[PDB]
Design a protein around this ligand. Structure first.
Ligand code: HEM
Ligand code: HEM
Ligand code: HEM
Ligand code: HEM
Lengths: 141, 146, 146, 141
């Protein structure tokens, strides 16, 4: 996955996202919690109410994490090694959930950058997210 | 499937503001581009070599409108879906042989396309409601697979 | 599900030979090992850190037997899967919130276990019949998701 | 992603398959065609009757392809490059079908190697098949 052309699209497209990564991560999460209830399970200690300071804060974590990955497409297994241990070994998140977040994330991007969300960029951004999901759900150790 | 009384309201409301001329064709096209293997069922449509040809193809908009049409019939007959899509079911199952999982993927791109079209009016609540409708339609077309 | 009269006879005849304890204990154990994220639902069972601790755990064997007995109810009521699993469908969907994909995984794991215990008697024809029964159980359990 | 323990498990279990990879491939295919009829669609030109010499021949190709993959666990993308282009670009095989073939391969292996097909082995062989399926469905790098 992730060919020369996809990388160019990913790097370019994240560029259009800029510093709203944090805000988009928060919106994506809210869309996931409301759209796919089964995912509320992993956050028993959170305030899942509209406008939560925990959700918004967490969304920020997800945002930088994705920005980090976009800068290490040649070695995702390495740059994300820690998050992988957290999600697959410690938290044991079900892989299906990653597709849901990915969907909610793309849906968030379609909302805010309708003119940059072309079919081609859509296709590249989908593969990028799958690859990140495989690494975080991987247990390569 | 089931939605709140106030849910059908916000849902059907949005559906009236939909361009049946476009949405249908952009959903199918994005499906053909993001998940290329689906192109295997649409060879007779002609050129699908690149995103430019697909979104431009005449048969994709035409067929797209038919698809977006039977989706509306879904938005209305929500509490009797198994019946409405019963015929299309034995069609995609017996003739075409389309895997159930693909109905889910088209439903999700349809959602993303709606998102690109209505922007912020397409709120997480509204999106949540549509995930229900999308899920039911998909399940109905799969009934004949047992 | 509805299988040919001959198939039923074949499926039911194999089940007379199934030891619910041995088979169930191994099926649930393999699920926990091959798909580690399923472990989250059984943290109360104790140490599941390694395959040796999982296969040896007494609660895994005990719950395994209960699960296999449930499949047996399905195999003897192939005409009424929906009604047979209605209660378990509420438990797994509404109460526990288990993703439906896992039901299929457990169904296939079960098939692999049967294949290992019956070897050459588990012919590709008998398996094909069992993929139907297993597929049948999965959908009935996912019935509350629709 | 395959770990070290997984690579060792795979290379060891396949040592057990030995020279029966071809036979197991044919049985796997026979189990798949009867277990999931839809897959026949992809073989309109084949004689899918029982004991078909056409299925045995193909089963052999698949068996060899897998023995080749086991020899290049460290670089599956490179060693299976041509198969990917054939399955993704020309054939356009729905990815779902790969899970069906993998389940039939595992089933076939459980039948013939009951004493060696332990939980641990089962687990690694599954990561291996998912990993091979990823490569063959990707229009990658
Ligand atoms: C795009 C994929 C995802 C990325 C990039 C991501 C990233 C992160 C990061 C950076 C952290 C650590 C933050 C910290 O140190 O406090 C984290 C924690 C966590 N993630 Fe994810 N995550 C993703 C998907 C998931 C999914 C799908 C779930 C489940 C629905 C999930 C559940 C959690 C939980 C429960 C925590 C710990 C929350 C806490 O206690 O603060 N993550 N994630
Ligand atoms: C939400 C699910 C879907 C809906 C509501 C839908 C709806 C339709 C409708 C209304 C028709 C036209 C039948 C007629 O006019 O008699 C049709 C035909 C067809 N559909 Fe679907 N469909 C869906 C998903 C799929 C998927 C995922 C595939 C792609 C693999 C697919 C492949 C086809 C094909 C190849 C035809 C034949 C078109 C022709 O040659 O005229 N459909 N579908
Ligand atoms: C083939 C599908 C399955 C069948 C037939 C099945 C059957 C059952 C049955 C009969 C019970 C025992 C109920 C009782 O003792 O009153 C049970 C409980 C439960 N099931 Fe399942 N189950 C299936 C799949 C799953 C999956 C995949 C998960 C895990 C992800 C799961 C998680 C649970 C949990 C957490 C309980 C409560 C355990 C306890 O405290 O006894 N089940 N299931
Ligand atoms: C474990 C993954 C799989 C492997 C290792 C595999 C391997 C191969 C190999 C080695 C060939 C090469 C033929 C040659 O050049 O001599 C081939 C051809 C082919 N494969 Fe696969 N394959 C796999 C899964 C699938 C699946 C899931 C399908 C679809 C159900 C599929 C459909 C085909 C078809 C139709 C051909 C062409 C056969 C012909 O017309 O001669 N393959 N595959």
């Amino acid at each position: 996955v992730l060919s020369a052309a996809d990388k160019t699209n990913v790097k370019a497209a994240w560029s259009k996202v800029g510093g709203h990564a944090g805000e988009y991560g928060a919106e994506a999460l809210e869309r996931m919690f409301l759209g796919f209830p089964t995912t509320k399970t992993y956050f028993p200690h959170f305030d899942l109410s509209h406008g939560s300071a925990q959700v918004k804060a967490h969304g920020k974590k997800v945002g930088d994490a994705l920005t980090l990955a976009v800068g290490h497409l040649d070695d995702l297994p390495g740059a994300l090694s820690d998050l992988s241990n957290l999600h697959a070994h410690k938290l044991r998140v079900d892989p299906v959930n990653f597709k849901l977040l990915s969907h909610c994330l793309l849906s968030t991007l379609a909302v805010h950058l309708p003119n940059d969300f072309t079919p081609a960029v859509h296709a590249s951004l989908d593969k990028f997210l799958s690859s990140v999901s495989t690494v975080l759900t991987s247990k390569y150790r | 499937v089931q939605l709140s009384g106030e849910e059908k309201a916000a849902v059907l409301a949005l559906w009236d503001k939909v361009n049946e001329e476009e949405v249908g064709g952009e959903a199918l096209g994005r499906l053909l581009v993001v998940y290329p293997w689906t192109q295997r069922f649409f060879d007779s449509f002609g050129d699908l070599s690149n995103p430019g040809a697909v979104m431009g193809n005449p048969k994709v908009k035409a067929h797209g409108k038919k698809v977006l049409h039977s989706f509306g019939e879904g938005v209305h007959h929500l509490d009797n879906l198994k019946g409405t899509f019963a015929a299309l079911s034995e069609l995609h199952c017996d003739k075409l042989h389309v895997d159930p999982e693909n109905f889910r993927l088209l439903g999700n791109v349809l959602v993303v396309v709606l998102a690109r079209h209505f922007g912020k009016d397409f709120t997480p609540e509204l999106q949540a409601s549509y995930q229900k409708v999308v899920a039911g339609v998909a399940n109905a077309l799969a009934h004949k697979y047992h």
